[PDB]
Write a protein that binds this ligand. Structure first.
Ligand SMILES: [Cl-]
Ligand SMILES: [Cl-]
Ligand SMILES: [Cl-]
Ligand SMILES: [Cl-]
Ligand SMILES: [Fe+3]
Ligand SMILES: [Mg+2]
Ligand SMILES: [Mg+2]
Lengths: 197, 212
């Protein structure tokens, strides 16, 4: 009762699907290898970090990113699959934003990278929309009670990034210095950028 | 489809397996894990055999216990395989022969889907809307926590997309609609049993109606 079905090892199944298709001429030469390379090397939270650092140091760009995220991202050439219609959401002294895909895993791939295992977990998918303050606390981020938390559930084609507040102690930093403290988790919204001692 | 994949608001799960800025490791943790997304794109872009919406739905169609004990990337291996069989591209026999063993698939659809709605409203920012109190056995991009609930429009998209409930079933009548960022108060969705502020759901026009 309630037992798992019999299954061949997952690697054997995944490569059987590849070979069944490839052996029918349906997969172009180098196709899956090219996607692997794009997923590993191109789609990256370093891109979202660059965007945040530019917004922090350029008021005109910040306004553009918050009003027409797609256009802002296109200036950098970072539109792409799962990242064609972009909305950036601004943290403020009284608002903390957080992104999820409760139904699956939807994420702004090109500028955040592919989602991490934890973001696709049933725990995150179930809990963050109902108890975001406790989830973030457990993950290491305390959001005071004077801050509204707003959770964006990625249920259609909009793809989100968080624009975190810029921390004190970074005045005058270069775009490169700023980028370094904007992490993947800051873009998803579960972390706040940290400034060293 | 009111399936087990509709997890938002479910109670009983434990801690999220992460602490902020912890090492997540490489993009792929095993040598096969790039295959489901790559082969999804082959099917959508190269073969034209299915849409991304059909991929979402076929994963929803995994038998519920099977879904719950299957790691993420494996669900998409199962889902893409299932579509290739359903569309006549591959056979289950050949998949099992190549795999050297069993390769159970998602379950058949129990719904033919539904067309893009004929009567909808163009909403404006600041307007109050209700999520239509409808039950859709096939694919839908409406998490159940918002069904029947009232919120306010924060954004109308400047682009339009095929209605999921049609294109997720490969139908010819998906049309195109914009989507709306609809902001709900946490208490509208979960009463007193929430610690949040607001939740913004990105909802197709055809899921919404003017609030009373
Ligand atoms: Cl992880
Ligand atoms: Cl492997
Ligand atoms: Cl209550
Ligand atoms: Cl209407
Ligand atoms: Fe998703
Ligand atoms: Mg300043
Ligand atoms: Mg349900």
């Amino acid at each position: 009762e309630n037992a798992a079905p019999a299954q061949a090892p997952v690697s054997d199944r995944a490569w059987a699907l590849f070979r069944a298709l490839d052996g029918k001429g349906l997969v172009p030469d180098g196709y899956v290898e090219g996607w692997k390379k794009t997923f590993e090397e191109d789609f990256s939270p370093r891109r979202g970090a660059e965007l945040v650092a530019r917004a922090w140091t350029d008021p005109e760009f910040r306004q553009l990113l918050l009003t027409d995220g797609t256009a802002a991202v296109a200036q950098y050439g970072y539109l792409g699959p799962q990242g064609e219609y972009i909305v950036a959401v601004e943290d403020t002294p009284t608002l903390k934003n957080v992104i999820v895909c409760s139904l699956c895993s939807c994420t702004a791939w090109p500028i955040l990278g592919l989602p991490p295992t934890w973001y696709k977990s049933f725990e995150y998918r179930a809990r963050v929309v109902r108890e975001p303050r406790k989830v973030l606390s457990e993950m290491g981020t305390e959001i005071a009670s004077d801050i509204e938390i707003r959770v964006y559930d990625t249920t259609a084609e909009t793809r989100y990034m968080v624009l975190p507040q810029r921390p004190a102690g970074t005045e005058g930093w270069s775009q490169e210095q700023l980028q370094e403290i904007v992490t993947k988790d800051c873009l998803i919204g579960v972390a706040i950028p940290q400034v060293p001692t | 489809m009111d399936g087990v994949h509709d997890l938002a608001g479910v109670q009983g799960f434990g801690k999220v397996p992460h602490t902020v800025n912890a090492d997540i490791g490489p993009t792929f943790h095993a040598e096969w894990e790039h295959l489901p997304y790559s082969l999804m794109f082959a099917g959508v872009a190269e073969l034209g055999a299915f849409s991304v919406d059909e991929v979402k739905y076929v994963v929803e169609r995994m038998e519920p216990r099977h879904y719950m004990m299957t790691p993420y990337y494996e669900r998409y291996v199962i889902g893409v395989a299932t579509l290739m069989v359903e569309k006549g591209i591959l056979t289950q026999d050949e998949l099992e022969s190549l795999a050297g063993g069993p390769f159970p698939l998602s379950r058949p659809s129990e719904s033919e889907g539904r067309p893009a709605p004929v009567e909808t409203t163009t909403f404006e920012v600041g307007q109050r809307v209700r999520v239509r109190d409808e039950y859709v056995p096939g694919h839908i991009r409406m998490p159940a926590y918002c069904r029947g609930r009232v919120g306010t429009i924060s954004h109308r998209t400047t682009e339009k997309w095929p209605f999921p409930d049609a294109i997720g079933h490969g139908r010819n009548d998906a049309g195109e609609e914009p989507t709306y960022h609809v902001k709900f108060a946490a208490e509208e969705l979960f009463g007193s049993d929430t610690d949040g502020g607001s939740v913004v759901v990105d909802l197709f026009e055809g899921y919404l109606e003017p609030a009373a």
